Design a protein around this nucleic acid. Structure first.
Length: 90
DNA sequence: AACACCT
């Protein structure tokens, strides 16, 4: 019964640290930060062994209401393009 | 899952 706050929504990655294992994405439609995790990334750069999201890179994802706040899921690049990811990515 | 720093 998980509620989906939003669907395919374009946003911008404020910053994502590979070492930390977590990061935040700033939605350009709501200007509100959302929780994001590597396991929440459906598609990513194939050249990267570890899933990651590039900083300053526009991303597309669905917003799902979370207990701690909005949660991002199925994060992919625009037009189905794979996420570039971060350089720190393995 | 509740906040930035790493090769």
């Amino acid at each position: 019964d998980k509620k989906v706050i939003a669907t395919k929504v374009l946003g911008t990655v404020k910053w994502f640290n590979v070492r930390n294992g977590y990061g935040f994405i700033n939605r350009n439609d709501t200007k509100e930060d959302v929780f994001v995790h590597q396991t929440a990334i459906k598609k990513n750069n194939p050249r990267k062994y570890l899933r990651s999201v590039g900083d300053g890179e526009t991303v597309e994802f669905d917003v799902v209401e979370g207990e701690k706040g909005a949660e991002a899921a199925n994060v992919t690049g625009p037009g189905g393009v794979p996420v570039q990811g971060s350089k720190y990515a393995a």
